[PDB]
């Protein structure tokens, strides 16, 4: 059973995956992310951030709201099932979390709530 992978974010607004596969065998999975580049995270943040699909939105947009300070997600968001921290390039910050979390047959999408940055930085997650 594979239960992590490595996934960067750069300075073009790229995460360089669009579609990860969680077994289910797993207990949990861990995500650890990275940033090549050099622009700051004041201007280039990504955090990787996992919802249902119907969720981002929401999810996105409150995050926006919420600013800087809050690493661009709503404090305490029941949505977010997991998430990394924002970070900017030359950090890394990894999240594990509870495979049971996900349900047979919803949809789950994972993306960045740095604004402007999710209608390109996003992607499925899905259960194996
Ligand atoms: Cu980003």
Redesign the pocket.
């Known amino acids: 059973a594979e239960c992590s992978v490595d996934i960067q974010?750069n300075d073009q607004?790229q995460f360089n995956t669009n579609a990860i596969t969680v077994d289910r065998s797993c207990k949990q999975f861990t995500v650890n992310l990275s940033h090549p580049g050099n622009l700051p995270k004041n201007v280039?943040?990504?955090?990787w951030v996992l919802s249902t699909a119907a969720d981002m939105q929401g999810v996105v947009t409150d995050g926006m709201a919420s600013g800087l300070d809050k690493d661009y997600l709503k404090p305490d968001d029941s949505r977010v099932i997991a998430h990394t921290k924002l970070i900017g390039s030359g950090e890394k910050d990894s999240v594990t979390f509870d495979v049971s979390k996900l349900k047979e047959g919803e949809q789950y999408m994972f993306f960045?709530?740095?604004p402007g940055?999710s209608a390109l930085?996003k992607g499925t997650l899905t259960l194996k």
């Open positions: 974010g607004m280039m943040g990504h955090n960045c709530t740095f940055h930085m």
